[PDB]
UniProtKB/Swiss-Prot annotation, chain A:
Residues 118-134 have a biased composition (Basic residues). This is Small ribosomal subunit protein uS9. Belongs to the universal ribosomal protein uS9 family. It comes from Pyrococcus furiosus (strain ATCC 43587 / DSM 3638 / JCM 8422 / Vc1). GO terms for molecular function: RNA binding; structural constituent of ribosome. Keywords: Ribonucleoprotein, Ribosomal protein. Part of the 30S ribosomal subunit.
From Swiss-Prot, chain B:
It comes from Pyrococcus furiosus (strain ATCC 43587 / DSM 3638 / JCM 8422 / Vc1). The keyword Ribosomal protein applies. This is Small ribosomal subunit protein eS28. PANTHER family: 40S RIBOSOMAL PROTEIN S28 (PTHR10769), SMALL RIBOSOMAL SUBUNIT PROTEIN ES28 (PTHR10769:SF3). One of its GO terms (biological process) is translation. It holds the Pfam family Ribosomal_S28e. Gene3D superfamilies: Nucleic acid-binding proteins (2.40.50.140). One of its GO terms (molecular function) is structural constituent of ribosome. The gene is rps28e. PROSITE patterns: RIBOSOMAL_S28E (PS00961). Keywords: Ribonucleoprotein, Ribosomal protein. Part of the 30S ribosomal subunit. Belongs to the eukaryotic ribosomal protein eS28 family. HAMAP family: Ribosomal_eS28. Transmembrane segments: none annotated.
From Swiss-Prot, chain D:
The gene is rps13. It comes from Pyrococcus furiosus (strain ATCC 43587 / DSM 3638 / JCM 8422 / Vc1). This is Small ribosomal subunit protein uS13. GO terms for molecular function: rRNA binding; structural constituent of ribosome. Keywords: Ribonucleoprotein, Ribosomal protein, RNA-binding, rRNA-binding. One of its GO terms (biological process) is translation. Located at the top of the head of the 30S subunit, it contacts several helices of the 16S rRNA. In the 70S ribosome it contacts the 23S rRNA (bridge B1a) and protein L5 of the 50S subunit (bridge B1b), connecting the 2 subunits; these bridges are implicated in subunit movement. The lineage of its organism: Archaea, Methanobacteriati, Methanobacteriota, Thermococci, Thermococcales. It comes from the Archaea.
Curated annotation (Swiss-Prot), chain F:
The gene is rps7. Belongs to the universal ribosomal protein uS7 family. This is Small ribosomal subunit protein uS7. CDD domains: uS7_Eukaryote (cd14867). Transmembrane segments: none annotated. GO terms for biological process: translation. InterPro entries: Ribosomal_uS7, Ribosomal_uS7_arc, Ribosomal_uS7_dom, Ribosomal_uS7_dom_sf, Ribosomal_uS7_euk/arc. One of the primary rRNA binding proteins, it binds directly to 16S rRNA where it nucleates assembly of the head domain of the 30S subunit. Is located at the subunit interface close to the decoding center. One of its GO terms (molecular function) is rRNA binding. It holds the Pfam family Ribosomal_S7. Keywords: Ribonucleoprotein, Ribosomal protein, RNA-binding, rRNA-binding. GO terms for cellular component: small ribosomal subunit. It comes from the Archaea. Part of the 30S ribosomal subunit.
Amino acid sequence: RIIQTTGKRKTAIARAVIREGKGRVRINGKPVEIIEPEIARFTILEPLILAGEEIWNSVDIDVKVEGGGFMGQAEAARMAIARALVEWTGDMSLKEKFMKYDRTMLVGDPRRTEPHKPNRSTKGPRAKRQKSYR
Amino acid sequence: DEGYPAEVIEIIGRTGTTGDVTQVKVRILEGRDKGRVIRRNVRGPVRIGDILILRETEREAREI
Amino acid sequence: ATVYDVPGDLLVERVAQRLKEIPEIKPPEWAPFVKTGRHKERLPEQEDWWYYRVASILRRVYLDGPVGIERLRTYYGGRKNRGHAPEKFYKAGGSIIRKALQQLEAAGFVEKVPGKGRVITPKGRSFLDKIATELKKELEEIIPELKKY
Amino acid sequence: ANFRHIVRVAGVDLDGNKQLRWALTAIKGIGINFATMVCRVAGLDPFMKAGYLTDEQVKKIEEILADPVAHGIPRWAVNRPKDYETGRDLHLITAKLDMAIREDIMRLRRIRAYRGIRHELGLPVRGQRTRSNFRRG
Amino acid sequence: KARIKIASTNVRSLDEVANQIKQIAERTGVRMSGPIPLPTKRIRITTRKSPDGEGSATFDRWELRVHKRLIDIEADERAMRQIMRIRVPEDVTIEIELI
Amino acid sequence: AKPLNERFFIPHEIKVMGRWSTEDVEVRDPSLKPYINLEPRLLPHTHGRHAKKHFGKANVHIVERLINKIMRSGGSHYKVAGHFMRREHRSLNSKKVKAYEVVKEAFKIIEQRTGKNPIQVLVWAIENAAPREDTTSVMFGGIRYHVAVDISPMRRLDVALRNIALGASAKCYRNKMSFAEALAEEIILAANKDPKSYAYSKKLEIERIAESSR
RNA sequence: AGUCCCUCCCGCUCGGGAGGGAGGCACUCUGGGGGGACUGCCGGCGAUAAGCCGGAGGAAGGGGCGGGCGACGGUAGGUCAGUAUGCCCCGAAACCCCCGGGCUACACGCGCGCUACAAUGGGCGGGACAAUGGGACCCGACCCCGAAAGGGGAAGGGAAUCCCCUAAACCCGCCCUCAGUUCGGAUCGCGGGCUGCAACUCGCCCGCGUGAAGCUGGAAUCCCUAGUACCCGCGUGUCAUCAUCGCGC
């Protein structure tokens, strides 16, 4: 038995497969334990800690992430892992725990980049050159 | 000093030169002026049920 | 264990230390007098930077093989300080990469697939896997969460 | 051993609390890169603190500076890759370097080249714009 | 097998041509791979609006979109003869390959 | 340099930074208690959320707010300690990894020096650096009058955090002290109430001016 | 992603990892058609309506978020030097071609920017992660030579098949430890290349050497309300070469 889930953030897409195993979570071929920076590692690891030790050791996950930066990839992996755990467990208690902790774990982030416009487009959409007057 | 806490109960309106200060009604929680309802001016965002620690309670902010 | 199971920096430094004993891998006659890339400012501060570079190249060939000189140059490039002009990314020199790949091939760790690049020989795979597994065995005591992998 | 606070190399006093690279950098005509090159040629660890140098090592450095190319320095890492007069590869230090550069500018001014005229006038020589910048007064 | 590449500046013409090909294929009875829509090629050109330099800078972004579809059809005499006579409107462009 | 166990630290419980808990942290004043957030959260990183929502800062962890505050450049259009600190490419703005590391180091230093919970020390510092009264102009008739006014708890907290961050930046600016060391010193001095802390000095100055214009 | 075969590697293999084949489209994605969000419902204010402030649910609550579309008229606002055009003018000249020079000068005032005045860092070795677009005298993998710039051969790609394309900021280890310095990179010497019929006026690139102001800024003044500002790199238009520039990512 396997379960597949997907997560998206910025421009990063993460596809996660959850199965029964020894609790070895691997991301892009690397163990999750040696992921850097520490902030990204914690971001990826939060759902497992929330779920608990027994479930973490019971199930294992394999994740493939493409696109975006390190933070975006970590967030996408976090979302995919949370969805996979929720679906696999099938219980609503941990689902409510996830909702009250961070509502966006199961619901993706809809924010995207605002297109640039003239008058310093390279700077950004609302950025503009300063006037001189006199 | 240690001041005196007072709980806001009503918002009157904004009465700043640039609309920066808000006028509210507060009741003193403890002290010998406890229970009295006074009207003061507060700077910054404020909601109902907030607690302002007033350095005194002797003066009342005049009506808008 | 596998190269994927351990941090890159520790594995590459260990691999360079091991490669120090391989007679085929020796610095070129111009190694003392050459910067690693056009974007760099001054010469390397390590008297044995050649072995570190060779180890990194071997790991890159292992992970992303087949690879070529141009792609390795792109990887080994970086930002440059152009002075009053804004900084820009630049590639690295190809001589170091070419010589390192030739030396690795002579040692037998890398074999060239025509029109595709350089892949890792089974000998090189065994070498890297052995070093990686000893490194993981060392790391297991320090951190006990890697025992299950 | 005898840790000298001040060491004189090639007629310039070097610091005793500074690594050999940046100590040799104190001599006009040598920078960090060429100092590291000289140390590697001489066989001295570039990172040793200047002051532990012995007489033999100092003399070896002097000889390397006198004839860097013959000691293994690449012909393309020297200060004067092709001498105008002799046609050989040279590396000049301090006073000789100053005299060589002065002689070059003087030769330009003597032949009346554009670069010589601009040198004597004190304006940019390499083709810059002088309308908005280079305001010296 | 035969490869059909159809490109046009309007979606409806491509839809009609693909529907015609699908009708031919289903009438013949041979296996057909549904039209694969390749990524649309959108070319953008930004041009200064003013014909002179005076005035605040403002630009217009002209855009042209080309839509492409791919079809794979089992090669047989009757079907190839039946698809060689497609209407091929003026905007649509058709390319035939055999493999 | 740092031990490999610390480099690859793996938390197992829900506590701030995975190292310090908030069970024993206490807030004394009732004004700031509702807004001072001690919710269990090991990653103080909410991204840009809660900015759009009004009064959405009341549900953001203290450490997250401090990290965001220190993630800045200092100076710009204001002078603290009588100097500008316009650092453009050397600033921490938009570098949450660096801000997080700085806060972690500062908390470690505070814990080592004091022997008490760094979050508790931060709460004490915020309490001691939170002003209570200010001066503002009011327009009546045809002229304006300066009048002393109160400060809402949210503004108190924001001013306290801003003052702490500016003080740390000022005393780390162009010195031998690291930014983390400066932040730890700022928090310690603010908790201890000595005028040496910029936050406490500014609170005293604001209160004195409020009394004068009262 | 699951299933089967082959090859290789490890702790000698309980177990784990990588590549290729057949095979699948399951997930991502591409692109056509539909649904959804409509003050829809609950409480309150407004007059019971116009409407307004909160809450539930929800991906999206109040113009869902960002863009295109700029009315009658005026501004004797800019454009005849983009094209069109009235009158006047030159009409063997102000018309048409060719060579050389200039628009690139430089006591000085100003606009907008890049680089910095350092530790919220400089250098060295190592370790990770994008997107928009472009490609026929064109992009060019891959191989060989060179220390770098760069040189020689050359597969595939008319582009969801090949290339530009393994970005930087960020992370780990070491040196530097507050100093005009291992900050700063102007200004000049020698030497080696690329494009171009032609490189001094007047192009760009790399090696060694050199090492000027600058140690945070007066009055005054400018941008910005969320994936916005700041920080940091990339694509393209100009292009035989040249991007501190405009438009986007």
